[PDB]
């Protein structure tokens, strides 16, 4: 089986934001994004002109459209994990949310970054990158790695 996982992290320091995305293919990091630049972290992805600019746009859209309020605490770390899996000709998916490292699932009746993050993250990502896209990318990436001169 194979997995393509995306780890979205938004760090809120006062009013400034630092965003990161790490992409893992079968538990190997292949792509990293630091808010401004996207980069390959594995040889077969070096020189890629198809996935890198695509993800760069997706990741930028994901973070820039998040409607945040001013933080009460000096630091807030918001995590959104998304993974698709293709095993035995079967497509499965998994996602979760972390606030300062801690998983949470329940939406509350107050206007906080923690709540907005939980409420909008999946919907926001799926606008440019849904499960079907993830599976296609996954299978395409697996083949690309196998066919690569590395």
TrEMBL record:
It comes from the Viruses. Gene3D superfamilies: MHC class I-like antigen recognition-like. InterPro entries: MHC_I-like_Ag-recog_sf, MHC_I/II-like_Ag-recog. Disulfide bonds join 84-134. SUPFAM superfamilies: MHC antigen-recognition domain. This is CPXV018 protein. The gene is CPXV018 CDS.
């Amino acid at each position: 089986g194979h997995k393509l996982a995306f780890n979205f992290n938004l760090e809120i320091n006062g009013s400034d934001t630092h965003s990161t995305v790490d992409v893992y293919l079968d538990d190997s990091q292949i792509i990293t994004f630091d808010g401004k630049d996207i980069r390959p972290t594995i040889p077969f992805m070096i020189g890629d002109e198809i996935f890198l600019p695509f993800y760069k746009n997706v990741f930028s859209e994901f973070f820039s459209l998040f409607r945040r309020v001013p933080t009460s605490t000096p630091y807030e770390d918001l995590t959104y994990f998304y993974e698709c899996d293709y095993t035995d000709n079967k497509s499965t998916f998994d996602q979760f949310y972390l606030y300062n490292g801690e998983e949470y699932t329940v939406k509350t009746q107050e206007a906080t970054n923690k709540n907005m993050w939980l409420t909008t993250s999946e919907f926001r990502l799926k606008k440019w990158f849904d499960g079907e896209d993830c599976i296609m990318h996954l299978r395409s990436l697996v083949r690309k790695m196998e066919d690569s001169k590395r």
